[PDB]
Amino acid sequence: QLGELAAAFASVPVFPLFDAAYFIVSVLYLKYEPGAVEMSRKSPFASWLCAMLHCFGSYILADLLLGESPIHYFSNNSSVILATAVWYLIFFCPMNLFYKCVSFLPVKLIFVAMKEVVRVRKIAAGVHHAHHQYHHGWFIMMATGWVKGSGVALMSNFEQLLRGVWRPETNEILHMSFPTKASLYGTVLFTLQQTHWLPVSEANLVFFFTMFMIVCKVFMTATH
Amino acid sequence: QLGELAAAFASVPVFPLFDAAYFIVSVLYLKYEPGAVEMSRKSPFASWLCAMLHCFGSYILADLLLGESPIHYFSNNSSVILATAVWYLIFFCPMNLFYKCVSFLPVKLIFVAMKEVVRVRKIAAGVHHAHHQYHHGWFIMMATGWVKGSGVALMSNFEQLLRGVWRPETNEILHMSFPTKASLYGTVLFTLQQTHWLPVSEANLVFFFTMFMIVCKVFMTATH
Amino acid sequence: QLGELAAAFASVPVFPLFDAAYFIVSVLYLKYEPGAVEMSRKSPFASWLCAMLHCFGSYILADLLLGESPIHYFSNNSSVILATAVWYLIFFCPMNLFYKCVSFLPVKLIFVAMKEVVRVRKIAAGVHHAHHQYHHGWFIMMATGWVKGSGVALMSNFEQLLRGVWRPETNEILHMSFPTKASLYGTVLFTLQQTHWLPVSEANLVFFFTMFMIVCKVFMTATH
Numbered sequence: 170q171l172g173e174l175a176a177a178f179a180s181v182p183v184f185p186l187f188d189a190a191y192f193i194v195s196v197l198y199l200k201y202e203p204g205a206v207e208m209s210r211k212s213p214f215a216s217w218l219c220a221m222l223h224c225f226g227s228y229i230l231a232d233l234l235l236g237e238s239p240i241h242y243f244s245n246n247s248s249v250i251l252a253t254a255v256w257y258l259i260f261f262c263p264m265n266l267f268y269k270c271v272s273f274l275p276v277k278l279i280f281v282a283m284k285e286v287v288r289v290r291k292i293a294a295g296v297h298h299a300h301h302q303y304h305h306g307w308f309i310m311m312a313t314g315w316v317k318g319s320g321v322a323l324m325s326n327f328e329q330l331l332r333g334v335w336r337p338e339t340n341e342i343l344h345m346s347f348p349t350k351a352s353l354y355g356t357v358l359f360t361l362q363q364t365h366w367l368p369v370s371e372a373n374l375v376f377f378f379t380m381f382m383i384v385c386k387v388f389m390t391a392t393h
Numbered sequence: 394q395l396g397e398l399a400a401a402f403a404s405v406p407v408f409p410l411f412d413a414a415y416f417i418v419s420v421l422y423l424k425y426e427p428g429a430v431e432m433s434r435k436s437p438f439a440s441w442l443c444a445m446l447h448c449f450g451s452y453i454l455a456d457l458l459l460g461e462s463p464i465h466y467f468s469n470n471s472s473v474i475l476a477t478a479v480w481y482l483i484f485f486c487p488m489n490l491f492y493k494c495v496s497f498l499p500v501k502l503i504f505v506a507m508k509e510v511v512r513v514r515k516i517a518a519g520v521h522h523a524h525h526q527y528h529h530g531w532f533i534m535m536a537t538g539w540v541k542g543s544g545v546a547l548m549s550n551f552e553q554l555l556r557g558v559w560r561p562e563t564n565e566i567l568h569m570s571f572p573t574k575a576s577l578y579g580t581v582l583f584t585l586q587q588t589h590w591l592p593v594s595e596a597n598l599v600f601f602f603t604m605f606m607i608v609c610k611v612f613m614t615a616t617h
Numbered sequence: 618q619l620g621e622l623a624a625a626f627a628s629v630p631v632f633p634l635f636d637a638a639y640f641i642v643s644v645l646y647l648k649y650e651p652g653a654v655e656m657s658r659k660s661p662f663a664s665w666l667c668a669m670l671h672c673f674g675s676y677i678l679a680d681l682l683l684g685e686s687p688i689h690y691f692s693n694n695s696s697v698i699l700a701t702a703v704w705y706l707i708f709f710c711p712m713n714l715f716y717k718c719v720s721f722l723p724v725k726l727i728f729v730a731m732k733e734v735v736r737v738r739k740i741a742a743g744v745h746h747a748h749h750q751y752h753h754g755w756f757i758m759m760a761t762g763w764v765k766g767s768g769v770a771l772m773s774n775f776e777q778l779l780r781g782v783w784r785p786e787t788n789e790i791l792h793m794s795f796p797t798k799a800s801l802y803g804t805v806l807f808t809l810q811q812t813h814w815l816p817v818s819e820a821n822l823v824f825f826f827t828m829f830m831i832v833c834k835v836f837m838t839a840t841h
């Protein structure tokens with residue numbers, strides 16, 4: 170009956186709870202970046218735009234690769250407003266209280282695990298969406314699933330440029346972080362499953378690769 | 394009968410006279426930039442391309458945001474040729490005579506006011522065009538109207554790169570100039586009017602916001 | 618009977634032999650770039666992506682200009698695999714044997730001539746493709762044919778960024794190399810032929826402009 174459990178796991182509604190966890194973890198990472206708090210004070214619109222890149226950079230990149238509107242996902246008003254509320258609470262909540270609650274390690278590890286549920290679903294969705302437009306476009310499927318999983322990391326040089334920072338000596342392709350490299354392995358697996366060369370159901374692959382990402386990220390977050 | 398006057402004001406044909414004023418003011422600003430005259434001598438094609446960015450950057454950015462051809466507007470041959478003639482006269486007219494005439498302060502203030510007529514129309518057109526593709530895409534409407542009004546300013550980091558200049562410490566989002574910030578207020582107003590939450594006719598909003606931009610820009614130009 | 622010879626010349630199948638020559642010459646140029654060999658060792662995925670830019674940058678740029686998927690051409694699996702095999706053999710063949718064979722000057726000059734056959738065909742195809750979407754879009758036709766011929770050179774600032782290099786003081790528009798400038802003359806000629814203002818058959822223009830590019834590039838390669 171594992172396939173019955175895997176089907177329920179792979180079809181949980183990500184909105185709003187799992188998307189909120191994705192936004193919280195991503196905007197927390199933004200606040201850790203150098204000068205981010207000062208930027209929220211002096212350039213609040215640019216700070217909000219930076220948070221939108223961290224929350225929706227996966228869709229911006231995937232739409233750019235497929236020749237669609239790069240801000241197509243911003244028509245989802247409820248998601249944009251939810252990410253905006255997360256950005257406001259993390260940077261401007263009185264007593265910094267919202268930051269204190271979501272940074273509490275037991276709470277943070279749960280949000281970290283929930284973000285990985287969202288990331289794997291976005292990888293698989295990118296492969297399936299590219300396949301719909303290119304039935305045999307294996308390289309387009311792998312590219313779309315990769316940027317859906319890596320997100321803002323692949324545009325880090327220009328997220329820095331928006332913040333007034335320029336560090337051209339490195340980038341996430343020249344030196345992949347773990348989530349970028351893991352998203353590359355994930356998009357190859359989901360493409361192979363789309364090819365019907367990997368004999369596994371799409372629900373089981375989602376379940377087992379999500380558990381791999383959850384264990385890795387929770388372990389990495391709890392260590393440091 | 395103000396609405397009858399506002400309807401005539403909001404429907405004046407911008408081509409060719411008001412577009413010419415837009416091109417003249419924008420290419421004048423290009424000639425003020427460092428190394429622009431030297432660039433016209435040594436790299437005339439790059440200088441012409443820079444002037445096309447200043448004249449049509451609003452359409453390039455709006456088409457990029459909506460997933461359309463970024464050079465779609467360059468199919469308008471008469472507009473491209475008119476902007477090309479303006480670029481040639483400003484940089485290469487014998488005796489620098491065309492520059493001397495359009496820089497004469499009474500003449501320049503008139504062209505500055507006429508450019509603001511074009512800018513407000515482009516903001517409203519961007520909101521209406523985005524609304525046609527996304528009936529409830531408020532964030533897409535505001536983004537499209539903003540870049541239609543700000544124009545080349547939002548791509549200033551890469552207009553500089555074309556000229557061989559790189560200044561990453563600042564950008565027009567991190568530090569908005571007045572026209573960029575005013576275009577942001579304008580696109581919010583025209584979006585609200587599109588929402589039917591701002592109880593005002595589209596013609597009256599065009600008239601009153603254009604007069605606001607005309608008074609501000611004419612005052613700013615005459616002061617410095 | 619020259620038109621009968623020109624028709625056969627202009628319709629030779631570029632895949633796979635002429636495309637292979639295009640890939641070999643382009644990836645050879647990549648290996649000449651500073652730090653390219655070290656990059657293939659330490660960042661092999663970024664090295665492979667760099668080679669894809671050199672092999673398919675013409676299609677990436679043309680699709681970007683026309684608002685299509687910038688990786689649309691990567692649905693051609695056989696072409697991507699052939700370019701991938703060329704990249705692997707040039708950087709990783711035991712004894713560096715493949716590099717030694719294709720760098721042998723008589724063999725290299727033949728591949729250089731065959732690449733020019735591909736470049737002229739891509740210029741003409743870009744003009745014809747833009748004309749199909751814009752019957753009177755002369756500036757869109759010239760832009761599309763130019764990037765189809767220049768290829769990765771027009772994105773050199775960002776091919777360098779992928780390699781961790783940033784040299785903003787120059788670019789291929791501000792200072793055109795010979796292939797970039799020759800592709801600009803070529804796209805004007807093919808646009809004029811599309812206008813029916815240049816009284817010459819498309820096959821004869823392909824033949825005579827290819828011979829011009831072959832003689833120039835073979836002479837330039839044999840000199841240095």
Ligand SMILES: CC/C=C/C/C=C/C/C=C/CCCC(=O)O[C@H](CO)COC(=O)CCCCCCCCCCC
Pocket residue numbers: 233234308309311312315316323324327666669677687688691
């Ligand atoms: C301001 C925000 C802009 C950010 C630009 C960041 C771009 C980084 C994205 C890289 C995706 C490459 C996919 C890949 O590297 O992996 C796939 C699977 O292995 C294969 O690569 C290919 O298909 C060949 C891909 C050729 C490069 C595509 C360039 C598209 C230009 C978009 C810019 C408008």
Ligand SMILES: CC/C=C/C/C=C/C/C=C/CCCC(=O)O[C@H](CO)COC(=O)CCCCCCCCCCC
Pocket residue numbers: 218221229239240243457458532533535536539540547548551
């Ligand atoms: C070489 C020329 C290139 C120039 C690139 C310049 C880009 C600057 C444009 C910014 C428009 C943001 C709209 C905005 O900031 O304001 C709106 C309204 O408030 C909300 O922002 C969003 O919808 C979220 C917008 C998310 C960013 C969109 C990135 C698109 C990538 C285009 C590059 C191909």
Ligand SMILES: CC/C=C/C/C=C/C/C=C/CCCC(=O)O[C@H](CO)COC(=O)CCCCCCCCCCC
Pocket residue numbers: 442445453463464467681682756757759760763764771772775
């Ligand atoms: C990461 C890879 C990105 C690389 C970006 C490189 C861009 C260089 C391409 C230049 C083509 C200009 C065509 C031209 O200069 O020549 C033609 C014929 O004379 C006329 O120019 C116009 O039509 C006006 C063209 C206005 C500029 C178009 C900007 C498009 C933005 C694309 C970025 C997403």
Ligand SMILES: [Ca+2]
Pocket residue numbers: 236237238460461462684685686
């Ligand atoms: Ca498109």
Ligand SMILES: [Cl-]
Pocket residue numbers: 202203329334
């Ligand atoms: Cl940083």
Ligand SMILES: [Cl-]
Pocket residue numbers: 211212213214215
């Ligand atoms: Cl601000």
Ligand SMILES: [Cl-]
Pocket residue numbers: 290291294295
């Ligand atoms: Cl998704």
Ligand SMILES: [Cl-]
Pocket residue numbers: 231294295296298317
């Ligand atoms: Cl997707």
Ligand SMILES: [Cl-]
Pocket residue numbers: 304305
């Ligand atoms: Cl098919």
Ligand SMILES: [Cl-]
Pocket residue numbers: 426427553558
């Ligand atoms: Cl400057």
Ligand SMILES: [Cl-]
Pocket residue numbers: 435436437438439
């Ligand atoms: Cl030039």
Ligand SMILES: [Cl-]
Pocket residue numbers: 514515518519
């Ligand atoms: Cl408009």
Ligand SMILES: [Cl-]
Pocket residue numbers: 455518519520522541
């Ligand atoms: Cl518009």
Ligand SMILES: [Cl-]
Pocket residue numbers: 528529
């Ligand atoms: Cl609808």
Ligand SMILES: [Cl-]
Pocket residue numbers: 650651777782
């Ligand atoms: Cl270099």
Ligand SMILES: [Cl-]
Pocket residue numbers: 659660661662663
């Ligand atoms: Cl690698």
